[PDB]
């Protein structure tokens, strides 16, 4: 599995590449249930290893 | 009488898997009841394909109503993304709406396609028959 | 020489009561000093009137610098919303400034009209002589 | 074959001091690689200078990445102001990606000149080769 | 008086069909004078029965 | 040194000029290492005076 997101690597478990601003992102962000944040999609697609 | 040149109402989306993992979802767009363009273009499943080269103009809007921070889509030359917009919207307010607009000059050869998705997957926008909301089109410069 | 084309710097508001319920400002155009469109259009009253039918480009964009988490703007074909622009700014900060544009192909035949509003009632934009924030314009393609 | 029309990927910034106390960081472009406009353009150092007298349409796109409140960028005819495009993003958040898109009608006489220039200095934006997110064209009407 | 907002019914006296988001909106958002969305006209013309 | 914002007369020791909003801006939004707004150059440009 590769983190590596336009040259900076994400934490393996806690973050992932995000599309949206090329940048790596919390994986929490996505997978908390009362974040306005919230994405199942994401967070089962990115963040398989979170939590 | 037939031009080079439509206006499209984005009336749905549906689920699509990209060439390069751009898994978002596709925008369909129904033909503004003045299209007139038999000859020019051709449309299936949301995918335009221009009949003869030349320099096309194209503009794309989607109006988001969800209360994700981010959102934003992509216009597709061929399955290249080359067109795109974006905005952040921060805060838990449930009460989020923005339009994205781009634009841009796409060169389409003969048989080649463009096409709209979103960045995303299961994101509200606003998508309705006669969208003044939420459209795309093209026109040959 | 003449030619269906336009710029318009958008220098004031008016109070402006719509067909369908639509009560927001009229926006009001000043003519670039390059414009010169003589027998292709009219305006009047921030109403502009086409005077052959075609297919004409048409861009707006309104500048807003005011406290409201919601603002936008609507482009009329007839007495019909066509085109729309919407922008979301959060939070009570007061140094809110965003700029709103939009764009589309709208088919209009002979003496049709378009004019530029906005969905709310005295809120501040920029307006001014030459302005070079909120600005709308067309052509013909 | 040449027409004059271009579309133009944002791939760097350099320090520019202005006119009149504009010393916002000057964007340059890199060409597409279907563009040929040998006779109708010339580009040196961000600023595209026109060869014959006529009106254009621009459109420009800059896609912020920073943590500022306030971002925008002007398009100069000569070394005036024409059109601009601001975003206000509030909140401490990182996570701040946005894309500011204008356009307009600029009517330029033979040997005038347009160039892109953010309001700001160091504001990260996407700037790269190919760049799919921050671009700007010009194509005569 | 007919509330309904793209299907959605809203509150008779607290709420009101906004054309900005075309969906149902507090009264109290546009009506009180220290909000940042403080809003007179759409109070006194969306608003008559709140408060 | 003139203040003159288009009309309003800014602050002057705590406020600038600012060009993106056309309105009198606090300096301390700008020189503040602690702030997302933090900006060196309009800092030292239009804040000369403050602190």
């Given at each position: 599995?590769?983190?590596?997101?336009?040259?900076?690597?994400?934490?393996?478990?806690?973050?992932?590449?995000?599309?949206?601003?090329?940048?790596?992102?919390?994986?929490?962000?996505?997978?908390?249930?009362?974040?306005?944040?919230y994405?199942?999609?994401?967070?089962?697609?990115?963040?398989?290893?979170?939590? | 009488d037939?031009?080079?040149?439509?206006?499209?109402?984005?009336?749905?989306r549906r689920?699509?898997?990209?060439?390069?993992?751009?898994?978002?979802?596709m925008?369909?767009?129904?033909?503004?009841?003045?299209?007139?363009?038999?000859?020019?273009?051709?449309?299936?499943?949301?995918?335009?394909?221009?009949?003869?080269?030349?320099?096309?103009y194209?503009?794309?809007?989607?109006?988001?109503?969800?209360?994700?921070?981010?959102?934003?889509?992509?216009?597709?030359?061929?399955?290249?993304?080359?067109?795109?917009?974006?905005?952040?919207?921060?805060?838990?307010?449930?009460?989020?709406v923005?339009?994205?607009?781009?634009?841009?000059?796409?060169?389409?050869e003969?048989?080649?396609?463009?096409?709209?998705?979103?960045?995303?997957?299961?994101?509200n926008?606003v998508?309705?028959?006669?969208?003044?909301?939420?459209?795309?089109?093209?026109?040959?410069?």
């Amino acid at each position: 599995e590769s983190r590596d997101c336009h040259g900076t690597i994400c934490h393996p478990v806690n973050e992932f590449c995000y599309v949206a601003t090329e940048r790596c992102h919390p994986c929490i962000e996505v997978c908390n249930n009362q974040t306005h944040n919230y994405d199942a999609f994401l967070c089962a697609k990115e963040c398989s290893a979170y939590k | 009488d037939s031009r080079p040149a439509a206006h499209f109402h984005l009336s749905s989306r549906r689920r699509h898997q990209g060439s390069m993992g751009y898994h978002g979802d596709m925008y369909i767009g129904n033909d503004n009841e003045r299209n007139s363009y038999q000859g020019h273009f051709q449309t299936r499943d949301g995918v335009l394909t221009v009949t003869n080269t030349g320099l096309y103009y194209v503009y794309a809007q989607i109006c988001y109503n969800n209360s994700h921070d981010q959102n934003g889509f992509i216009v597709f030359q061929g399955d290249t993304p080359f067109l795109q917009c974006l905005n952040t919207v921060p805060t838990n307010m449930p009460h989020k709406v923005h339009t994205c607009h781009t634009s841009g000059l796409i060169h389409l050869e003969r048989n080649e396609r463009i096409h709209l998705k979103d960045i995303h997957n299961d994101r509200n926008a606003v998508l309705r028959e006669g969208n003044n909301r939420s459209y795309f089109g093209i026109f040959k410069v």
